[model samples]
Target: STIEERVKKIIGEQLGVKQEEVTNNASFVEDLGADSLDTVELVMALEEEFDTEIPDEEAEKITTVQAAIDYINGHQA
Candidate 1:
């Protein structure tokens, strides 16, 4: 599966939400009800899922579902 699909599934599962709720524009904290810890877990999950390491600078910019997908696509091994 592509990054978007993989990201959506992870976000949906982590946030305890349905996949449909994790739209491209959905904010991780505001829309998805993710706290700082949840966001950290989300990044960890993405890193694990894609086999990549997201630096803190790059990770901080990933505040939406689409951003995570983009990062994964760019950094995937």
Candidate 2:
């Protein structure tokens, strides 16, 4: 799968939501039933899966599945 697909799957699993529910516009907090802690864990999972570091500031801004995908696509080394 592409990075976007992988990210959607990971976010879906982390949030206990279906992959189809993890649309680009879906909000992690408002739409995906994710709390602050869940967001942190999701970021950690993404970091591990992508083998990259997401600074706290950057992590804080990734509130949607698309945002995570964009960051990973741009930062993969």
Candidate 3:
């Protein structure tokens, strides 16, 4: 029922990391051990999973796990 934990699992799956490692402050690019294309795919997955859209401009700024949840919750509901 929480967007935060809901996003946590999605990030763990997309980044191929354990949910334990998908910390709120984790960096998708660095802490998550990923890439440019990796983030794009992650964003794509998020859009589908959340049934929402992310402007590439905004998507580019969602670099950290906290940033992702913030953006999703802010934009979604």
Candidate 4:
């Protein structure tokens, strides 16, 4: 699977949503019902999955599924 696909899968699992619900435009808080702590956990999961570190400022901006995917894509090893 592609990076986006993998990200969607992880986000879906983390937020207790279906993969289809994890669209690029979906907001982690508004659409997926993720809270502040959930978002932090999701960032940790993304870091572990992609083996990359996301800075606090950048992680704060990753509110949407596409944003997470883009960050991972940009930082992938």
Where does the lowest 10-residue lDDT sum fall in candidate 2? Answer: 13-22
lDDT of 3 by residue, 1-77 (tens): 68998888889998899888899898987899988888899999889888998998999899999999998899874
Q: How do the residues 1-77 of candidate 2 rate in per-residue lDDT, one tens digit apiece?
A: 88889989999988889877899999999999899999999999998999999999899899988899899999986
Q: Please report the candidate that would top lDDT against the real structure.
A: 4
TM-score of each: 0.94, 0.96, 0.93, 0.96
lDDT (0 to 1) per candidate = 0.88, 0.91, 0.89, 0.92
- lDDT by residue for model 4 (1-77), tens: 99989999999988889777798999999999889999999999999999988999999999999999999999987
Total clashing pairs for each candidate: 0, 0, 0, 0
| For model 4, the run of ten residues with the poorest summed lDDT | 14-23
What's the candidate order when arranged by decreasing lDDT?
Answer: 4, 2, 3, 1
Look at candidate 4 and give me any clashing residue pairs.
Answer: none
What shift in Å separates residue 7 of candidate 4 from its native position after superposition?
0.6
Q: How high is the lDDT of residue 53 in model 3?
A: 85
Compared with the true structure, model 3 gives a TM-score of: 0.93
Tens-place lDDT per residue, model 1, 3-24, is: 7898899999887888878999
**Regions of candidate 2 where Cα sits further than 4 Å from its true position:** none
lDDT of residue 42 for candidate 1: 87
Candidate 1 has its poorest 10 consecutive residues by lDDT at: 12-21
